[PDB]
């Protein structure tokens, strides 16, 4: 997903090639992003 | 304390907004006329890369001029940009304009101007300066705001003109009240203008120099 | 557009306002995985060497970007030139288990060994500031240590990284009205 | 389709360009500041990594 | 046939009019993408290379044909003997930047390096001849550029090669009525 | 397509091997080799 | 165009080439590679070729970079014989096809 282009699969598996994540229970800066204000604010003539 | 009457004029790729709007007077029409008419034969053409913002300094107004103090603009005026060149290469045009004019001090200067779109305005006369609301008008008085915005259509006895020996629309600015600026006003007031042609529209292409 | 610029809300006006067109953009070379995911030279100690992101230089592309985020997270991968065997020992590991090659030891093949190595932190993520003494950073902010004969190379490569918080990232400051350089030129 | 974000040394115009702040004027302004700051747009987009020195 | 020559539509005339019967061809040899896709030798210098195809003879078969043709557009793989590791930067790239290993930099491996690398110019197409200073072609027409301690050897191969408007190619001018040669023979 | 002849799959993917090509909104030659007329013009005899 | 009359021989190539930074004398034999047409006088007085703008690049800045160049060559030399006129001035009308234009200069103002 970063800077990897093989398509056949790894030979090892997903536990030993990477640590794996637990759970308990572009996020912020992409919401952020969408959220910018892009329009006008006045009244627009023409 | 400042204002939400606020507009943004786009005339081309240029745009133009205020804070203290007052809206805009439209004179006499709010469409043009017929563009296309018998004396061009088919042949006119619209020039929508005119169609913009340009700009020039008109006067300052200062507590010394008094009621009846007027600046005049003949339009079209001196252009060095595509709309100045148009007149060189074609014999007929015809546009009407978009004016918007800024009188900017502050809001504790006092005082009063008139501007006005005055068609055919061979000079005026001292007693006519109390009609000059007759012609599409807006003013600008410092408490309230700051610019004035005022459309006109094309005009003239003719459908179509020949700038270099005639000029159909003069701006005037008249000062109605003198300014003051009492201990925080502004010290004087630079007005300036900001001025679109609209519509315009040629026909008959003109010899190179060459 | 005009706003209220105390506010902090994004603005993002476009050409459209005067009527221009936004084009489409493709900005798979700014994604964090992809950008931070490539080798940067590091140089080493001549035996132990702790794997310490903080020794990449900060004027390098992965340095300049990994401290432009105030927490991170990623696995690794190294590359190393050594003499003799390798051992790599994990976060919290005696500094002397470096000498028990039941520890992940590597038998020297030329020309050099790369590694994939797991995160080991104890903590949930790292991060490269932190304001406990205020320059030194907590021990346990670490990926382990490696130690051979000699280490002559050590090259990092951060896997499936994580970003959090953004800081400052600053380009040259130039001394005359545009830093100038010599381009790659026919 | 793309320019460079580096300038160089050969290029003693700028090639992309001048942006131009002006004051068309003021009243009793004298003195205040007016701050600006820049952002990326829409469609602003940046390919190719590099790494040049540079800090 | 009889037509206007003045013209410049194509007149194709076949045997058929005397008689004979148009035979069968196979073109795959005059293929664009298959003729330029082979490796060519070009002198390297030794230690920055721009990659740049107009280095490559005009004599031979891929200058000849190349120059054949005013806008290109082609992927390229290279092969180098070099000494040390090689660095490559993409088009635009300061020249200082050949110093850094993040660059893809290919550690030596005997006996030489092949790499594949993408079109990388801001342009949509490149060309062989430009009319701007009118032999001086713009800086931005290069394929990046490449570093090591020493070059020794660099060959050019163009991968899905386009080629847009042909322009003359030339063959030997023979001083007797024809050019003879000693052709491979048993 | 050019000169390449394995039967086999390319290991890589397609966005690490080649750049991408993108769009926006033999060609010529061959549409003007194909319209040369091949003809005769006068009136055949025989 | 080249107008002198039926009378007169020699044969002249009209070419429209594409970054034309000068030309070698050999290459002249393939000139017929561009978008060409031929005048010559037992037939015609008008050669006409369109072209569509070519380049690396989508827009250009024509004040640095020209890219097409109009040439004409004597492929037969001229024969004015009895009847023919004397010489043929030749002469190009052209017009721009499709003219677009992108960012708006200041004046000189």
Not at chain 3, 1 to 8: F, K, M, Q, R, V
Not at chain 3, 94 to 99: G, H
Not at chain 3, 133 to 160: D, H, Q, W
Not at chain 4, 11 to 34: M, P, R, S
């Amino acid at each position: 997903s970063g800077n990897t282009g093989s398509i056949i699969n790894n030979y090892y598996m997903q536990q030993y090639q990477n640590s794996m994540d637990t759970q308990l229970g572009n996020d912020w800066f992409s919401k952020l992003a969408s959220s910018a204000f892009s329009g006008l604010f006045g009244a627009l003539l023409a | 304390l400042l204002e939400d009457r606020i507009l943004t004029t786009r005339n081309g790729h240029t745009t133009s907004t205020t804070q203290s709007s007052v809206g805009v007077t439209y004179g006499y029409a709010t469409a043009e006329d017929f563009v296309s008419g018998p004396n061009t034969s088919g042949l006119e053409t619209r020039v929508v890369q005119a169609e913009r913002f340009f700009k020039t300094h008109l006067f300052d107004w200062v507590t010394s001029d008094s009621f009846g103090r007027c600046h005049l603009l003949e339009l079209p005026t001196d252009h060095k940009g595509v709309y100045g060149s148009l007149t060189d290469s074609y014999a007929y045009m015809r546009n009407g304009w978009d004016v918007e004019v800024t009188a900017v001090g502050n809001q504790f200067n006092g005082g009063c101007l008139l501007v006005a779109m005055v068609p055919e305005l061979c000079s005026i006369q001292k007693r006519e300066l109390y009609q000059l609301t007759l012609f599409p008008h807006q003013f600008i008085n410092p408490r309230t705001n700051m610019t004035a915005h005022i459309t006109v259509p094309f005009v003239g006895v003719n459908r179509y003109d020949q700038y270099k020996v005639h000029k159909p629309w003069t701006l005037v600015v008249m000062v109605v009240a003198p300014l003051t600026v009492n201990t925080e006003g502004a010290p004087q007031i630079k007005v300036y203008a900001n001025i679109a042609p609209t519509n315009v529209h040629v026909a008959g292409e003109f010899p190179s120099k060459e | 557009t005009t706003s209220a610029g105390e506010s902090a809300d994004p603005v993002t006006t476009t050409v459209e306002n005067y009527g221009g067109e936004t084009q489409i953009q493709r900005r798979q070379h700014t994604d964090v995985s992809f950008i931070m995911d490539r080798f940067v030279k590091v140089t080493p100690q001549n035996q132990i060497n702790i794997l310490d992101l903080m020794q990449v230089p900060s004027h390098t592309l992965v340095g300049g970007l990994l401290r432009a985020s105030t927490y991170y997270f990623s696995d690794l991968e190294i590359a190393v030139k050594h003499e003799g065997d390798l051992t790599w020992v994990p976060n919290g590991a005696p500094e002397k288990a470096l000498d028990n090659t039941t520890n992940p030891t590597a038998y020297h093949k030329a020309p050099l060994t790369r590694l994939a190595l797991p995160y080991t932190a104890p903590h949930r993520v790292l991060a490269t500031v932190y304001n406990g003494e205020c320059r030194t950073l907590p021990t346990s902010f670490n990926y382990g240590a490696i130690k051979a004969t000699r280490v002559t190379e050590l090259l990092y490569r951060m896997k499936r990284a994580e970003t959090y918080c953004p800081r400052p990232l600053l380009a040259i400051h130039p001394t005359e009205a545009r830093h100038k350089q010599k381009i790659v030129a026919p | 389709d793309y320019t460079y974000t580096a300038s160089d040394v050969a290029e003693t115009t700028n090639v992309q360009g001048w942006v131009c702040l002006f004051q068309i004027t003021h009243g009793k302004a004298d003195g205040d500041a007016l701050v600006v700051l820049a952002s990326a747009g829409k469609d602003f987009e940046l390919r190719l990594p590099v790494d040049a020195r540079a800090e």
